[PDB]
Amino acid sequence: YTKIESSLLLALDYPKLDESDFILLLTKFLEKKLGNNDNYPTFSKQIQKYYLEQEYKKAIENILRLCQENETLLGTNLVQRLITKSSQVTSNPKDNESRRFYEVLYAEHLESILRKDFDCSIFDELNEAYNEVRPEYTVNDLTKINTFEEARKLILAFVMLNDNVELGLKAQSAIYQKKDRSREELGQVLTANPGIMKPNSPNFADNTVPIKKIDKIAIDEKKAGGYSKTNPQVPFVASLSGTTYSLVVVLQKYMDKHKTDPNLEKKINNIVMLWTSAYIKDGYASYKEVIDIFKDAHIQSIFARANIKLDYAIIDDTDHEFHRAQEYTQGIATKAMMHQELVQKVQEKS
Amino acid sequence: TTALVCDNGSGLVKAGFAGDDAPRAVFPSIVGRPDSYVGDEAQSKRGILTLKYPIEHGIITNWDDMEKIWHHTFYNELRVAPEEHPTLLTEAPLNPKANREKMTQIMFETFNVPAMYVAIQAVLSLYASGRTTGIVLDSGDGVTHNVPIYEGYALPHAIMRLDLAGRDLTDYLMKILTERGYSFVTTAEREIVRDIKEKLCYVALDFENEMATAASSSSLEKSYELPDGQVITIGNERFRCPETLFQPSFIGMESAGIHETTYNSIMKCDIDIRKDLYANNVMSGGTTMYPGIADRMQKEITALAPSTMKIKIIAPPERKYSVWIGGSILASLSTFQQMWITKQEYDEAGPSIVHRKCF
Ligand SMILES: Nc1ncnc2c1ncn2[C@@H]1O[C@H](COP(=O)(O)OP(=O)(O)OP(=O)(O)O)[C@@H](O)[C@H]1O
Ligand SMILES: Nc1ncnc2c1ncn2[C@@H]1O[C@H](COP(=O)(O)OP(=O)(O)OP(=O)(O)O)[C@@H](O)[C@H]1O
Ligand SMILES: [Ca+2]
Ligand SMILES: [Mg+2]
């Protein structure tokens, strides 16, 4: 066990190690070991895509496959320890610190993509479709949208439609009945972490944001078969994003008004990417809640009957967020192990 | 390889080696310019030299004087080669990230240390007591901090700074002793007043009762022998000067006491961790060394806190150096050895690595 192997094996001892943590740490270890291989970048990209889609079992299986293939270069006992650990990890929706960090950086990357070559016509037409949907008692001060910030403001203003225009979609939806967010109003809590990161979770000194108040939202444990309980890898910032159904209503009116648009699928994907970026970066919902709204049976039917194929904001180049989340996971697990050792040392000293 | 632990304060630089129970070199953190003199050498030549503080209110502002302080600590104070030792450093709570990057840049580019680490002083003070979660009252010489720490992480949304520390108490004691006819206007007089503050001043459990007793009887008066043979008597000043910590209005500051700021910080924290914050209230810094400050803090917080809450104040007798002691506990750990920002990691990542490893 060299320094790299010792660091990995110490980090894996983290009691709060989860699937996301396991995948990130093991991929960092394998990128240090086998990163000189010619075929490795394909494996890294495939694991990054499996991680973004939260296909943790597939990424774990691919990592175990690579480890067993390079078992001679890695070490049979080390690879056996990794294999034993892979089946011992789980995820809790309330605290997925590495996954929350990754999703926030992913939303920042989505915004960075959107600001590059931003098309204002898409969101001008989105606002026009919004005006044709919103009730008479809701106002809209955005006469036209010219920059990214105004489009984001409109996207966030779609919350007004909630509890009105999308009741039909929520009623027909089969997974929204599994939304298990506890409705009890817990107030607000101060936080300096961006996006959906918990207030008490560690963050990099350059990643904190100005201190602000965020709603404190919990899980309705009494719900039978709730969404969050069923989907544990999803960081519970909220439950299934209900306002995304209002987005789906506005997108219905957007597609019905642009049936002859050749790039309707591209524009819809751009709008969904902005919605996902804004709802993650502002902590309203995580990636998987919005995407599972878009992955519902009849919502997918709605998007298919207009011949629109949703990519669910999925991008192919997640290098920076994955590596930063690997560094974050290493820091968290190493510091937890160090806290264990330091507590033991001080308890024995005194 | 022995790991250097260096706590840099506004008044005191405390440097030593990991594993030691006390800083080998505790010296005033001043820089004298007419070539420069650092520490006690500049303090002796106050008339000839002009003195400047590279650290004000716990945040490093003068980087040239801070670099001079670090060079003096490594060579003139510890007499060790920086390039052979992993140097653990300390930072103030809510330190600007540019300051951390500049710190690591100077550590690796000017001193060429093989490794380094930056930790928040309150976090080290909490470590030295065997705790990872708790609230630290880091009251030093230039600034007081209430820092809630959740598993080694200092929550930026609840840390609060109060520009009221030992130096302000020394100035207040000078003012009161001037009110009583004792002339304290010179630098040597300031130093002897600081000595009086350290040796005689204390925090009164009940300030009004203490003032009444001091006015009525003379038992609370203490005698102090000045360097020039003069003997002075100090009465209510033994508890009026420390009381500025709990009643800043004594020095014209409109902010809240240390107990009120502690309660405010705990209130800014998530309601789930407030019980742990109350049960682990760690006092650190030289300004927390006044006798009776632990009992007074406990009583005041118990008044502010809910009745069912259990408040315990941890004030170790070695709390004046608890930042350095926590650093020495840190830098001498086996699991900490991979946490050092190595010269290789700095070279391949740049200064910003301090954000991704030291947090
Ligand atoms: N633009 C916005 N401004 C403020 N809060 C927002 C905004 N968009 C979403 N949120 C908040 O995000 C949280 C979860 O978002 P979600 O899409 O589930 O909406 P919701 O109102 O909770 O939906 P539902 O009523 O169907 O439960 C809620 O607290 C919601 O108020
Ligand atoms: N026994 C004591 N009682 C009260 N005050 C004391 C005592 N001993 C030292 N002090 C004062 O404590 C101050 C130094 O405290 P400390 O060394 O913890 O802080 P510092 O590192 O200089 O400052 P900071 O970290 O706030 O920038 C000085 O003002 C000194 O006079
Ligand atoms: Ca200090
Ligand atoms: Mg609502």
XYZ file of N, CA, C and O in Angstrom, chain B residues 1-6 14-25 73-74 77-81 85-86 88 324-325 327-329 331-332:
140
model
N 11.231 14.134 10.006
C 10.519 15.367 9.691
C 9.613 15.806 10.842
O 8.724 15.070 11.272
N 9.855 17.013 11.342
C 9.065 17.602 12.413
C 8.219 18.730 11.842
O 8.726 19.581 11.104
N 6.935 18.735 12.184
C 5.987 19.677 11.609
C 5.926 20.950 12.439
O 5.626 20.907 13.637
N 6.199 22.082 11.796
C 6.127 23.385 12.442
C 4.672 23.797 12.601
O 3.891 23.710 11.650
N 4.314 24.259 13.794
C 2.989 24.805 14.058
C 3.170 26.265 14.431
O 3.866 26.580 15.404
N 2.542 27.155 13.668
C 2.696 28.592 13.857
C 1.321 29.241 13.874
O 0.656 29.320 12.836
N 2.796 32.587 18.128
C 3.125 31.418 18.934
C 3.575 30.315 17.987
O 2.760 29.755 17.249
N 4.864 30.003 18.001
C 5.436 29.045 17.076
C 6.114 27.922 17.842
O 6.598 28.113 18.961
N 6.139 26.751 17.227
C 6.783 25.612 17.844
C 6.737 24.416 16.926
O 6.470 24.544 15.729
N 6.984 23.246 17.501
C 7.026 21.998 16.757
C 5.869 21.104 17.175
O 5.487 21.075 18.348
N 5.315 20.380 16.209
C 4.212 19.479 16.500
C 4.650 18.415 17.497
O 5.783 17.930 17.457
N 3.744 18.063 18.400
C 4.024 17.146 19.476
C 4.384 17.816 20.785
O 4.216 17.203 21.846
N 4.869 19.055 20.738
C 5.146 19.808 21.949
C 3.846 20.257 22.599
O 2.819 20.421 21.936
N 3.897 20.453 23.914
C 2.729 20.847 24.684
C 2.614 22.357 24.849
O 1.655 22.830 25.468
N 3.560 23.124 24.308
C 3.528 24.566 24.430
C 4.403 25.176 23.349
O 5.402 24.560 22.954
N 4.062 26.363 22.853
C 4.878 26.988 21.805
C 6.281 27.288 22.304
O 6.469 27.913 23.349
N 7.275 26.828 21.544
C 8.661 27.086 21.911
C 8.989 28.571 21.842
O 9.858 29.051 22.580
N 8.297 29.319 20.986
C 8.605 30.731 20.766
C 7.299 31.518 20.732
O 6.601 31.523 19.716
N 10.378 34.105 12.593
C 9.946 32.919 13.322
C 10.743 31.692 12.902
O 11.177 30.898 13.745
N 10.946 31.516 11.596
C 11.638 30.321 11.121
C 13.119 30.357 11.474
O 13.662 29.383 12.006
N 13.906 32.733 15.429
C 13.161 32.333 16.616
C 13.159 30.830 16.836
O 13.330 30.376 17.973
N 12.957 30.038 15.784
C 13.031 28.587 15.891
C 14.366 28.024 15.428
O 14.712 26.899 15.805
N 15.115 28.781 14.624
C 16.425 28.363 14.122
C 16.344 27.022 13.395
O 17.161 26.125 13.606
N 15.341 26.887 12.525
C 15.179 25.696 11.704
C 15.051 26.115 10.248
O 14.631 27.230 9.931
N 15.425 25.203 9.362
C 15.285 25.443 7.933
C 13.830 25.248 7.528
O 13.266 24.179 7.787
N 10.729 21.252 6.702
C 9.656 21.018 7.661
C 8.310 21.322 7.021
O 8.160 22.378 6.374
N 7.312 20.452 7.174
C 5.942 20.810 6.790
C 5.362 21.794 7.796
O 5.227 21.481 8.980
N 2.537 23.904 9.413
C 1.114 24.111 9.645
C 0.887 25.560 10.054
O 1.538 26.057 10.978
N -2.481 26.995 19.263
C -1.236 26.310 18.944
C -1.269 24.863 19.408
O -0.733 23.983 18.731
N -1.862 24.593 20.569
C -1.929 23.216 21.047
C -2.754 22.362 20.094
O -2.388 21.223 19.785
N -3.121 22.976 16.914
C -2.284 22.812 15.738
C -1.227 21.736 15.914
O -0.925 20.996 14.979
N -0.642 21.647 17.108
C 0.366 20.623 17.369
C -0.261 19.240 17.445
O 0.373 18.243 17.083
N -1.493 19.154 17.941
C -2.224 17.892 17.884
C -2.513 17.522 16.437
O -2.467 16.347 16.057
N -0.877 18.596 13.411
C 0.267 18.343 12.548
C 1.048 17.101 12.940
O 1.906 16.664 12.166
N 0.781 16.526 14.111
C 1.449 15.317 14.567
C 0.546 14.094 14.497
O 0.742 13.142 15.258
